[PDB]
Amino acid sequence: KAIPKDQRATTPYMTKYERARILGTRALQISMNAPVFVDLEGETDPLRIAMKELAEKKIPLVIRRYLPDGSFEDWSVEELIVDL
Amino acid sequence: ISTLQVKLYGREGSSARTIKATLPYIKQDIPIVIIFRALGIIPDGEILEHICYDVNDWQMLEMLKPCVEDGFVIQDRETALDFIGRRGKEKRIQYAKDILQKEFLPHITQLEGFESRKAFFLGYMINRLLLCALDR
Amino acid sequence: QENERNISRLWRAFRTVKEMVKDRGYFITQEEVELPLEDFKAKYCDSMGRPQRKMMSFQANPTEESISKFPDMGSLWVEFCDEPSVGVKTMKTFVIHIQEKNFQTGIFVYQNNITPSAMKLVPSIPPATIETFNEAALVVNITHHELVPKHIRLSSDEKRELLKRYRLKESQLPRIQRADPVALYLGLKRGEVVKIIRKSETSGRYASYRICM
Amino acid sequence: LEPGHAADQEQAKLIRSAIEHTTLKSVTIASEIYYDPDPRSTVIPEDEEIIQLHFSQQSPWLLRLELDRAAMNDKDLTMGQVGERIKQTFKNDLFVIWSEDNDEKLIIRCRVVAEEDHMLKKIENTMLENITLRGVENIERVVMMKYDRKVPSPTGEYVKEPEWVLETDGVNLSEVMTVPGIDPTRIYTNSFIDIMEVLGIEAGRAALYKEVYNVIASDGSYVNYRHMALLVDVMTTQGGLTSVTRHGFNRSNTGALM
Amino acid sequence: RLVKALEDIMVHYDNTTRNSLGNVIQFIYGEDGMDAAHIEKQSLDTIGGSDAAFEKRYRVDLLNTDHTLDPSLLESGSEILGDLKLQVLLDEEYKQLVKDRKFLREVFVDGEANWPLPVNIRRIIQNAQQTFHIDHTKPSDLTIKDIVLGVKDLQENLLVLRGKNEIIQNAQRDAVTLFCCLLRSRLATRRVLQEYRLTKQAFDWVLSNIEAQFLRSVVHPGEM
Incomplete structure (x- = not known):
């Protein structure tokens, strides 16, 4: 079973925990010389690069939000709004 | 190192305001009249004389009435020591008669020629107890 | 007299x-x-x-x-x-x-x-x-008291709706005693969920729910 | 107090007199047991007028109560109240006489209607403990404290409308709120137990929060609502009042390791 | 003890406060779904004051030549006098304000106005009359419809829960009831046009900003 892309009830805004987790994961990837999907423009710090990569929505990750009943809603990072 | 306790049963309001005592490794608590009669002081009044040092104090004696009512069953020394022994056939008396010498108030004497000392002292403890119970 | x-x-x-x-x-x-x-x-x-x-x-x-x-x-x-x-x-x-x-x-x-x-x-x-x-x-009347909010005894369809929309089980709902004076006042049987509508200093209206056991 | 009479402290005194507990023991100087054979002629020369006026089968043993004149004024009750209380307590198996309040000796005489002498004592015992002259049990004392209160004026604004409120040492909510004279919709106790038992689990929740918040704010501190609300809600969701100990939440059906 | 008792409790992705068993402690966290960090003590100036002052501060009567909006306030105040259709909207607004007054006076019986709520509206307004540099001697280019229907439509965006069923929507209107009382109280036509003297642009900016800050003030799921 799953939950359809329509009728998703969770917050369209990215939580700070989701943000920290995504930035952390992406920084973990960059720290092991993984391809960068944005222009460095002088940046060398993996976390900073992950932040700039987040601002441009160039992070190919997806958040699986778990409801207490066991259900789950999938929200791509590109779709989630970052207002923090 | 022995610890003697004199308990006043029945709080303020209760009718069964009896006074008992705890003797070294003896099963249940013993009424004070039984203790006094086990020490040689048999009749009433003389016990009260050992407790209440003022015959004018009618309140204290009034408080001592149910104690007399309690120990009315035992009317002699032999049956008093027999009572304590039953707690703890005649051997029990010799058991009892030992506890009142070696264990009951050892700080005065552990001899055998002293019974009035411990009796008067016990009466003193009763006096203090009742003085505290009468809010004096 | x-x-x-x-x-x-x-x-x-x-x-x-x-x-x-x-x-x-x-x-x-x-x-x-x-x-x-x-x-x-x-x-x-x-x-x-x-x-x-x-x-x-x-x-x-x-x-x-x-x-x-x-x-x-x-x-x-x-x-x-x-x-x-x-x-x-x-x-x-x-x-x-x-x-x-x-x-x-x-x-x-x-x-x-x-x-x-x-x-x-x-x-x-x-x-x-x-x-x-x-x-x-x-x-x-205890229900007239200040600290006593209004309890609304809802139907079986309303209950199933409540259990469905919050995707809950009956054990996951807040519980109310059968001998609870309010439950006695409404005459609640076991399993009957009540919608408790209380006032709130942070939202104004807040609706809790309590299943009877 | 009642929504009507708010500033009328004279009624608040009546309610205080109708709530605060009052035992016979609390107003008794002393008690005696005489042997008075002839009922129509007392040995005591002080009770001659009393038995003379109460003329217009029994027991020779007499039970004589002497009350405190000052204590009868504090509790605000008459000799007739006490006598009729004892009468209503023992009904027919206790003949009861007493002197009027105008006399200088507040006296009560009681007679039973072998081994009888040490049978009356118990009676007087039950007359001292198990006797309620007036008020509710457990309610040990009541104090008239005039609280200030914000009330909507007919013109609109909020005005300080001060009301007489009865504080109390002692708790018995189950019988105090059902007393004619007070507003039973605003009555409150710091014992959220009694609230939870009488008014329900939700009122118990509200009182519990009120009390925790009171503890916090008494120090002058301030904690946001949602925290204490969360605590109280967790204490109250199980159906009753779950303690924060090894007896309360630790007996829940959660994980073993937790 | 407190920690170990409240240990496994957090806000899930339906704003429900539960435990490890999934047992609902609070259906909406903090009964309003807001994070305590983004909450400030704001006054509800409709719960206080006389009815006379309340009317003097909130009543708009286009049918009355005395209790109407002066042509100095609104840019269309002259052609607005006597408009029945707009007076319907204003009577609606004022009636809703009265209902809010009753409700608030029922909730806070002691008459307290200062209460912690999300989104500091005062700072937003005083930032509006600072960013756009509006003078207190110029007719606002707003309209009755702009303000009334604008504020009425702003409340539809203040989302805490986001279901599509009746229950969740009821919980939604319940959770934002207080803040909406604050909103209606602050963004009333009389208040906006006379006290604030906001422009159309500034008003829209205020609405957008309020919505934004409200969405920021919501508790984040996963919050232990």
């Missing part, structure tokens, strides 16, 4: 009973509830002065508005007993009364206490329910 106090207390108890029954979803006019003590004395008290308690016992009918939500809800029968220490003797009469009259809810309002030999046959006549109430426990 004691007469006026008994009459007044029984009167307030009667008013509270009417409020309760009309809160359960039965037809009771507001004018009937607000029955003055003068009228009460001139309708229930004898010319001698003795308060005829059995003269008060009446029946109540579910409103169409209540039939819409709860169709299975039948007529209710309020009974004010005269005997103080009610034993099994009057209990048999009351039980057989509800049995023959064929009602769904019987309110037994005693003035002192009930023998355990009489409460032994109270929950034994399905589907009808017999509820015991002390007169002194109904002198003041």
